[PDB]
Structure formats: C-alpha cells, structure tokens
Design an enzyme around this catalytic site. Structure first.
Site, PDB file in Angstrom:
ATOM      1  N   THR A 104       0.817  -1.211   0.000  1.00 41.17           N
ATOM      2  CA  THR A 104       0.000   0.000   0.000  1.00 41.17           C
ATOM      3  C   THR A 104       0.857   1.271   0.000  1.00 41.17           C
ATOM      4  O   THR A 104       0.325   2.378  -0.088  1.00 41.17           O
ATOM      5  CB  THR A 104      -0.944   0.035   1.222  1.00 41.17           C
ATOM      6  N   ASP A 157       7.875 -11.688 -27.743  1.00 39.73           N
ATOM      7  CA  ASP A 157       9.037 -10.812 -27.635  1.00 39.73           C
ATOM      8  C   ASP A 157      10.208 -11.376 -28.446  1.00 39.73           C
ATOM      9  O   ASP A 157       9.991 -11.989 -29.499  1.00 39.73           O
ATOM     10  CB  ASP A 157       9.405 -10.680 -26.157  1.00 39.73           C
ATOM     11  N   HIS A 206      15.949  -8.894 -24.146  1.00 32.08           N
ATOM     12  CA  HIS A 206      14.708  -8.213 -23.774  1.00 32.08           C
ATOM     13  C   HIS A 206      13.594  -9.189 -23.372  1.00 32.08           C
ATOM     14  O   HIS A 206      12.972  -9.041 -22.310  1.00 32.08           O
ATOM     15  CB  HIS A 206      14.313  -7.268 -24.922  1.00 32.08           C
ATOM     16  N   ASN A 234       6.874   3.908 -24.995  1.00 34.48           N
ATOM     17  CA  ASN A 234       7.881   4.728 -24.322  1.00 34.48           C
ATOM     18  C   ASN A 234       8.125   6.078 -24.989  1.00 34.48           C
ATOM     19  O   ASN A 234       9.261   6.550 -25.048  1.00 34.48           O
ATOM     20  CB  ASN A 234       9.209   3.970 -24.252  1.00 34.48           C
ATOM     21  N   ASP A 268      -5.075   1.340 -18.988  1.00 38.80           N
ATOM     22  CA  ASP A 268      -5.909   0.696 -17.986  1.00 38.80           C
ATOM     23  C   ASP A 268      -5.259   0.669 -16.609  1.00 38.80           C
ATOM     24  O   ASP A 268      -5.956   0.616 -15.598  1.00 38.80           O
ATOM     25  CB  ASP A 268      -6.215  -0.738 -18.408  1.00 38.80           C
ATOM     26  N   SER A 291       7.672  -1.920 -21.328  1.00 35.58           N
ATOM     27  CA  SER A 291       7.980  -3.342 -21.511  1.00 35.58           C
ATOM     28  C   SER A 291       8.273  -4.086 -20.203  1.00 35.58           C
ATOM     29  O   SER A 291       8.163  -5.314 -20.147  1.00 35.58           O
ATOM     30  CB  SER A 291       9.215  -3.485 -22.408  1.00 35.58           C
TER      31      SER A 291
HETATM   32 CA   LIG Z   1      -9.392  -3.837 -20.936  1.00 33.41          CA
HETATM   33 HG   LIG Z   2      13.390  -6.500 -21.679  1.00 31.14          HG
HETATM   34 HG   LIG Z   3      11.033  -6.443 -16.419  1.00 28.41          HG
END
Ligand SMILES: [Ca+2]
Ligand SMILES: [Hg+2]
Ligand SMILES: [Hg+2]
Length: 279
Positions: free
Chosen positions: A16, A39, A69, A161, A200, A224
């Site tokens: 929290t 990915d 990545h 980004n 969202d 990401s």
């Molecule tokens: Ca949604």
């Molecule tokens: Hg990554």
């Molecule tokens: Hg990550």
C-alpha cells in the site's frame, strides 16, 4: 510468503506504500497458470526459470533470445527471484529478431498463434500473454490483440515509451486488452511512459532488475518492464481464483492502489497494480 530484498517493483506490487523491499504473495504463486511472452524469445535454460520456461514458436532462423529483452520480461513474469508469479509456466514466442525489431505481419501471426496454441498447453488456472512491444497505430495489429483476448487469454500490452498519448500506438490503443503504463520507485509516472484514456493500469517500469541472456541479470526500464508485472499479477490472481482472463484487467484496476502516482496527465487513470495480499 515473503521474499526479502526483492526488486523494488515486486515489493511495490504487494504494498500500500512505496519504499519497502519485501515482496509478499500467496504461496500458490501462479501454479497451474501459463504466461506467453511475445518478444525476442526466452533463454529457457536460465537457472532462474527452474525448468518452467520453454520456447514454443519462432519466426526466425532460431528460437534463441539473442537480445535479452524477452528473457528480462519473462523473468519479471515468473523467474524465481525476479518474478511476480514464481510457479507459472512460461512460453516464449519469438516475433522480434535479435535487434528487437519485428514486422507487423509477424507480430500478428504470433498473436494468432497464441490464441490457438493455448489449446495445446496445460493451463487449468488460465492463460495470460505479455506483449512488450509496439509501433504506430494499426487496425490490424489492434484486431489481432483483440482476437487473442477474445479467445480467452488475458492480454497485457505495453503503453509505449514515447511520453505521448498511447491512442496513436498499437496494440496499446486496443480497448479490449490491458494497456500498461510505467511508474518509478517513488510513485512517479516514468518519464518515458505513454499516457492517455486508453491506459488501464500502471506497473513498475523504471530500473527493473530481472534475468538476462548468458545466465545473467540486468536492470533496464520501459513500459515493456511494467507489462510483465501486470501479466504475472494476472496469472497469480487467476491461480487464486479471484478473476478470469476476460475480467482480470478490470479486476486489477478495481483493486489497484488509487490516486497515489504523480505526474499523471489529466484524463489518464491513476491506478497502480496491487495484489491485495494480506500475509
Ligand atoms: Ca481492458
Ligand atoms: Hg526487456
Ligand atoms: Hg522487467
């Protein structure tokens, strides 16, 4: 369960308040769920994955992650040390080459692949997909993401980004999937994070420690990195029976830490992913 000295993002998702370092989670830990990481691939042999990761598809000469990545993102979903859902099954779908690039047609094929492929996997608690990729607006890319979601997969996608409105990016702009912005350890919107009505939820995205190729680890930043926190959270909640693929994004938003982030542009949700776990 309690994991001390956890990466800040894991601690954040079970807290929290910012500024703590222990990750608390129900021991079920996403067991019986599955998460696809769409990915650059996943280095499944990484000790951190404990045999729970596998490559299931590639569109290139190899299924190996020659970038890192995808391995990093997978680690945040479900690695033993760096992951949200430490007992989930991880499936790698390599739609991005080792430079991190992918043609939209290949990305679309990968999404449709997952919608079918889940019928070839054992995921009694449910199926999630983490899409830490994006580009300019494309109705075809959005529609593919929508199909994947419709098929019964909780789709989490990076907002992007660009420090811009995500309405101009895909699959970020698809309404039916869960679009994830990034925050930092001081509860500020990450400086690169996209924003806007189509978001969202936010998750930890700045300075995220996770797995890397060559059996290593790495801190990197991006939406990401936020996306797999949300994907792992969904898998975790689905294993607990708290929600389903169709409702998980809504449930996460319903149960998020609310109004706690700074520099959220007017009109963007102020919601930070939170597991509501009481140890
Ligand atoms: Ca949604
Ligand atoms: Hg990554
Ligand atoms: Hg990550």
């Amino acid at each position: 369960a309690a994991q001390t000295n956890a990466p800040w993002g894991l601690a954040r998702i079970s807290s929290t308040s910012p500024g703590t370092s222990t990750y608390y989670y129900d021991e079920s830990a996403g067991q019986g769920s599955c998460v696809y990481v769409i990915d650059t691939g996943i280095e499944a042999s990484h000790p951190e994955f404990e045999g729970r990761a596998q490559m299931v598809k590639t569109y290139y000469y190899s299924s190996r992650d020659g970038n890192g990545h995808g391995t990093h993102c997978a680690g945040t979903v479900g690695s033993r040390t760096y992951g949200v859902a430490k007992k989930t099954q991880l499936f790698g779908v390599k739609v991005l080459d080792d430079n991190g690039s992918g043609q939209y047609s290949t990305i679309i094929a990968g999404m449709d692949f997952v919608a079918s492929d889940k019928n070839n996997r054992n995921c009694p608690k449910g199926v999630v997909a983490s899409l830490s990729l994006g580009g300019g607006y494309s109705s075809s890319v959005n529609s593919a993401a929508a199909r994947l979601q419709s098929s019964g997969v909780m789709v989490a996608v990076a907002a992007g980004n660009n420090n811009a409105d995500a309405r101009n990016y895909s699959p970020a702009s698809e309404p039916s999937v869960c679009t994830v912005g990034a925050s930092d350890r001081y509860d500020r919107r990450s400086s690169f994070s996209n924003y806007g009505s189509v978001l969202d939820i936010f998750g930890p995205g700045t300075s995220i420690l996770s797995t890397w190729i060559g059996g290593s680890t790495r801190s990197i930043s991006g939406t990401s990195m936020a996306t797999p926190h949300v994907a792992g959270l969904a898998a975790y909640l689905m294993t607990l029976g708290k929600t389903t693929a169709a409702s998980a994004c809504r449930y996460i938003a319903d149960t998020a830490n609310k109004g706690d982030l700074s520099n959220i542009p007017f009109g963007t949700v102020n919601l930070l992913a939170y597991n509501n776990y009481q140890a």
